[PDB]
A paper describes a structure:
Poxvirus encoded M2 protein is a member of the poxvirus immune evasion family and plays roles in host immunomodulation via the regulation of innate immune response mediated by the NF-κB pathway and adaptive immune response mediated by B7 ligands. Here we reveal that [name] M2, co-existing as a hexamer and a heptamer, recognizes human B7.1 and B7.2 (hB7.1/2) with high avidities. The binding of oligomeric [name] M2 interrupts the interactions of hB7.1/2 with CD28 and CTLA4 and subverts T cell activation mediated by B7.1/2 costimulatory signals. Cryo-EM structures of M2 in complex with hB7.1/2 show that M2 binds to the shallow concave face of hB7.1/2 and displays sterically competition with CD28 and CTLA4 for the binding to hB7.1/2.
We finally determined three complex structures, M2-hB7.1 hexamer, M2-hB7.2 hexamer, and M2-hB7.2 heptamer, at an overall resolution of 3.04, 2.7, and 3.12 Å, respectively. The resulting structures reveal that M2 forms an oligomeric ring structure with B7 proteins binding to the outer face of the M2 ring in a 1:1 stoichiometry. Structural analysis reveals that M2 interacts with hB7.1 and hB7.2 similarly. The interfaces of the two complex structures have very similar atomic contacts and bury a total accessible surface area of 1760 and 1617 Å2, respectively. M2 binds to hB7.1/2 side-by-side via β-strand complementation mediated by the C-terminal half of the M2 β11 and the N-terminal part of the hB7.1/2 G strand. The long C-terminal loop of M2 sits on top of the shallow concave surface, formed by the natural twist of strands G, F, C, and C’ of hB7.1/2. Extensive residues from the C-terminal loop, β8-β9 loop, and β10-β11 loop, and to a lesser extent, the β8, β9, β10, and β11 strands form a network of both van der Waals and hydrogen bonding interactions with residues from strands G, F, C, and C’ of hB7.1/2. Specifically, residues E122, K123, F126, K127, R128, and E133 from hB7.1, and residues M120, R122, Q125 as well as N127 from hB7.2 form hydrogen bonds with corresponding residues of M2 protein. For hB7.2, CTLA4 makes 14 contacts with hB7.2 and M2 makes 15 contacts with hB7.2, with 8 of these being shared residues. Surprisingly, the binding ability and half-life of M2 with hB7.1/2 significantly increased in this setting, leading to a KD of 0.15 nM and t1/2 of 397 min for hB7.1-M2 complex and a KD of 0.05 nM and t1/2 of 1180 min for hB7.2-M2 complex, respectively.
Numbering used by the authors:
A (entry chain H), E (entry chain L), F (entry chain G), H (entry chain K), J (entry chain J), L (entry chain I): 27 to 132
B (entry chain B), C (entry chain A), D (entry chain F), G (entry chain E), I (entry chain D), K (entry chain C): 20 to 220
The structure:
């Protein structure tokens, strides 16, 4: 697993290899907690905030070039493991293609 | 000397938690019915196969090139019409990922021909694949966790049997497909859940 | 991909309220008898058929060109010798009106040859027709409400089964015939009514 | 269109009180035995036939040219060795008097060949006749009231069945024969009387 | 049915048509009440009084020409229907050939 | 459905298309309440009042040209939906051919 | 017209007390055993026959030229090793004395070939005879009273059956034989006596 | 039956016809009461008294020519019916050949 | 006339105490087991035969030239591993001594071929002989008292049966053999003894 | 049976006929009581006293020529019947050949 | 004369403690299950054979050139996954050591082909040998004590049967094999042990 | 069995005959108590002390030439029988080849 450091800024990377070399334009990219509350939601390149829980509301930023979510304002409570899930949205059906679990200790 | 499969028997007691199949449906199933699920096992030419009839669904899941045979299954109904299936084989004699094929065909409510057919890639380590095909429009979501590291706490094992499960993350596998415009949500509530062991085999 | 019928089974649990058949008779039936009604289903060449033996009557009702099959029926006896039949199929896969044929043949009391044979027009939207024929002089009134929007409150559903009914007025159908010089009166009192689920299928 | 007979069935519920047969015997029958009477019905070529075995007697009564079939019988033993038989058919579809044939043959006590054979004329309206023949010397009196206007108050009908009887004097019929030098006396005391419904049909 | 008038003398007729034209010499002719007590009894032309109930004892007369029983001394009690029964006595067996029910209101 | 206005006069039309173009001379035309009490009854062109409930007794008028029942003297109670039923009287059997449900809010 | 025998049946209820057979034995029988006696009846060519197996004895008694058939028997054991048999036929249709044949053959204790064979004359009116033959040395005395005027008070009749017996001395018959040097003594004590109805027929 | 007269001497006859014309030398001839107590016993022409009850002990006489037992000293108690039994003693077996029942009222 | 055997039957009640067989064994039998002994009877060509399976022993005893057949046996276990067998036939029709043959073959513990074979002379009156043969080394002592004058007081007879035994010393017979260097000691303690009636015949 | 006389000396004989004419050298000759206690024991011509009960210990004498046991010092208690048993000792097995029961009243 | 084997029977009662087989396994068996063990016996050509199915193991043990046949077995589960088998034959008719062959084949958990095959020498007196072969990797230890001088105190014998065991050290035999790098430890804890008698034979 | 003497030094010999004439280099040689606690442990010629119970810890010596364990400092408690077990260590599986039981009374 991958961990992050103390109370400045946490970096959670998906580390998607992208072996099929497909673009981010058709890719559902999102993060979630060990208690399964959504952190961010990238639907087709636009961040969606409707499913984001109020605890992480307006706290997370996303970097598309490094495929990394930056969590700001670390607390004592958020020591759980965070997993990022990458679906590939297809009109016939949305298929999960990648998932990874990282840790976070502050 | 080679480590082989065990011979078949009527009642198996050493179960290995192989899979967590988590079909979501769009028709109403309200509770877990005692004595509802019926399973049929087969082990022909190194392919394990289990057919599960219950809760309006038939699940034909086969695993290719394995030294395992399906010996048990427990089905349970969660909230929001979710159907969790727990599957158990004999023992893990190999540490390699196996290719999976699931056929989810709808027995009642929304019935039809092949609505879906795809190869779901394995989410972690990308070693295997799940040839899924869905015969009917009665399925919202499919989640399959092959060799999970955690049992559901709501599943009670029989006293005379013994349960083993995976403990390594490297042997975990995740396959998932959604047909409804909602991210994830295939997961069970795990608040008020009850499991029933299927009847035959 | 096409949405098709579900395969047959011994015990169906997802019922759709298709029809409310309300035969009035001129001979005395005093109360609902437990275990009296016997139904036989068939689904041959896209035609659903149910034959109901009970309370001195046999009802052979078939629906043409449907993706539904009759799975359940509940018969009840109201006041003034009225016989209410509630019919249940699998599911509504089409939003089109279907042609109906009812054969009401009298098993006991007043028995005979073909007293009546007509095509009753559908009262609302006039899309379908009911080929009715009555074998015997034992029938005062026939009322048939196809896809009703309201269940009878006196009908209790089984706990393990699920019930669905129509909610749109555009799918409602009314067919009626009277042979006695009294306007309407085919309707049940709905004061002291009890229903029995028929035996077979 | 013509009003016809109803088809046969195992258990008939709509009974019509057709006849009151009141054989007096000269041997001792003390009380009504539960489960004693056994009846056999037939309806061949528009002739109804009932054969009653019980209380030392066999009664073979057939009615010619009828749209009725015998569906029930209740036998009871009165004082002074009198045997009252109540007979029930389906329904009265004609208002004409029918010719009657009774064969009273003695199973035990006084047994023999054809003691008596005659045509008893109908007492009121003289439209029909009763071909009676008695095989044995065990019969003192025969009284047969065809379509009576009154049921015996000592006969209790089953709760699940329905009873109809004649209400017109013009449809009444009386046939009687005595072989003992006593006027009438064929009638029952109707003081302490109990009836048993016969077993078969 | 046939009724009769008030407290002078009641006439109950059998109204036997006698279509077989047989004589009264072999004919059992008798009357009875709704509670089935015998009024008169003509066996072979001779009145028999042994089965006559004590209530109608020596009260009834019989007319063979009109085939009619005359009941004298009408009471308030005897308002019931009276039926006359005609048997044809044969040595093989006595056969009832006619019956009729008349009424009586006083 | 079809509704009507306030406390002056309610108009309930059957809106029978009469596609078979048959006359009113052989047609049973009547109206009824949500609790199924008969308002009017046109049997063969003559209004019959025996089955009319006492609540609507002598209150309803009928127009054959517009096929419309006029309900007078609107009350607070009669806010239910009213349905009109048209049977086609045939000597073999009376067949319902049309029904319609209208509403009424005052 | 002739008065004939009644047809056979499984359970006869009108019994006529025909005979009192009173075999004395020299071996010990202490009490009446419930369900011990077994009888077999036959009526072939106007000859009634009863075979009684019980209490160490088989009794083959046939009556010639009769319109009666043996329908019942009750066996009882008195003091001093006496065996009383009560026999019952259908009815007495003739007032003539009938010839009797009794075969008393010994099943256990003293067994052998034909110890005795004689024609016992009828004691009163001397009209008939009893061809007796005794197969074994186990018999001390034989007493047979044909058509007795008195029933044994220790014999209780079944409630559902009816019993008739002779009332005239002219129809009585007495046959007796002793092989022990004691006058009479064949008679029962009638102090503590119990009868059992035999099993078959 | 045959009866006898008052308190002087009772005569009970067997009235054996003796159709086989056999002698009394081989004949067991005896009498008994309704309660079956032996009165006399003639075995082969010699009276035997061992089975005679003590109530009739030395009270009865026997006449072989008339085949009649004379009972002396009549009492009030002995009003029962008396039956005489005649066996024919044969070495193969003793056969009862005659019995008769007479009465006795004093 | 000759006195013969009685015919066979399923349940015999008149038993005659014929023999007291008193096998001592060297292996441990601790108590009498209810329902242990099984006997088989035969009577072929005037030879009675009984085969007794129980308590590790099979006893094939036949009596030559007899009018008796073995009808019952009761086996009991005394102290010091002694096995007492009581045998019962029908009746004693002759007062002559009969020749006896006993085969004692060992079913369990010490088993083998013909350890012993001899003709034991009758101890009192020397009229008969007992051809004994012992198949196995499991027998210490054999005592056989033919027609004993005394029953064992520890043997309770069934209530419905009758028991007779010898009363004359001239009909007594004693046969005995010991293979252990101890005078006599074949006799039972008769202190705490219980008998079981063998199962068949 | 055979009895003996009063309180001087009892003589119990076996009365073995010895029809096989075999000698006493191979013969087990012994006596016993009704309660089955051994009196004497002659095994092969030598008296054995180990199985002799203490009540008859040193009280009995044996005569081989007359085959008779002499019991001395008669008591009131020893009135029972005494039986003598003669076995023929063979190496294959010891066979009882004779037994006799005598009585003893003093 | 020769001392031979006893004939076979359904229920044997004289048992001889022949062997103490003490397989240790590496999979979890937690407790002794009532009615788990199933044994099959054979005695063909002087070779005794017992096959034991239970607790995930099948034990095929045959003894060569014996006059004994296996009649009973009791299996029990000790701590640390140890399986103790107690075996019982008929009787010891020879005082010679016999050659032993054990096949331990694994029914469930770790299954395979012939993991092990060797001839274990007898530890004390070195007269015999044990041809052991193990089909699977599920066995840690094997201990076999042939003719032990001590029964396990935790084994309760049935009341109706009798038990014998060896008392001489010269007839003792020890065979042992370990596949885990721990000296001995095959022995049971004998602290909390329960035995079950196997089902068949 | 083999015993030893009083409170000086106990000698427990295995008395292995060594008929296969194999060396001690591949032989697991050890001793144990009646309560089955290990005394010594010779694995491949080197004494191993990890399984030795603390009661016999550093108390036992071993002689390879005589194959004998010398137990020093005899106590009152150690009067039980001691058994020596000789396994033959093979890479396929360790096979017990010899065992012997000796006694010890002090």
């Amino acid at each position: 697993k991958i961990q992050a450091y103390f109370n400045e800024t946490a970096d959670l990377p998906c580390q998607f290899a992208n072996s099929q070399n497909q673009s981010l334009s058709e890719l559902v990219v999102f993060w979630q907690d060990q208690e399964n509350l959504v952190l961010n939601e990238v639907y087709l390149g636009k961040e969606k905030f409707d499913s984001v829980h109020s605890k992480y509301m307006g706290r997370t930023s996303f970097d598309s070039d490094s495929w990394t979510l930056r969590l700001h304002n670390l607390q004592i409570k958020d020591k759980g493991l965070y997993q990022c899930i990458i679906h590939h949205k297809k009109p016939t059906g949305m298929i999960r293609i990648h998932q990874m679990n990282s840790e976070l200790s502050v | 000397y080679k480590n082989t499969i065990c011979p078949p028997r009527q009642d198996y007691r050493y179960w290995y938690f192989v899979a967590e199949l988590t079909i979501g449906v769009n028709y109403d199933i309200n509770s877990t019915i005692i004595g509802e699920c019926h399973m049929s096992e087969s082990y022909i030419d190194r392919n394990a196969n289990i057919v599960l009839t219950g809760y309006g669904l038939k699940i034909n899941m086969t695993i290719m090139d394995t030294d395992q045979r399906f010996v048990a299954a427990a089905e349970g109904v969660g909230k929001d019409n979710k159907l969790s299936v727990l599957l158990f084989t004999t023992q893990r004699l190999d540490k390699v990922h196996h290719n999976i094929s699931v056929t989810i065909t709808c027995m009642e409510m929304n019935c039809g021909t092949t609505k879906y057919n795809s190869d779901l890639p394995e989410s972690i380590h990308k070693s295997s694949s799940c040839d899924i095909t869905i015969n009917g429009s009665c399925v919202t979501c499919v989640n399959l966790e092959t060799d999970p590291t955690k049992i559901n706490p709501h599943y009670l094992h029989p006293k005379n049997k013994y349960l083993y499960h995976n403990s390594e993350y490297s042997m975990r596998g995740s396959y998932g497909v959604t047909f409804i415009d909602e991210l994830n949500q295939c997961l069970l509530d795990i608040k008020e859940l009850s499991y029933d062991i299927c009847y035959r085999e």
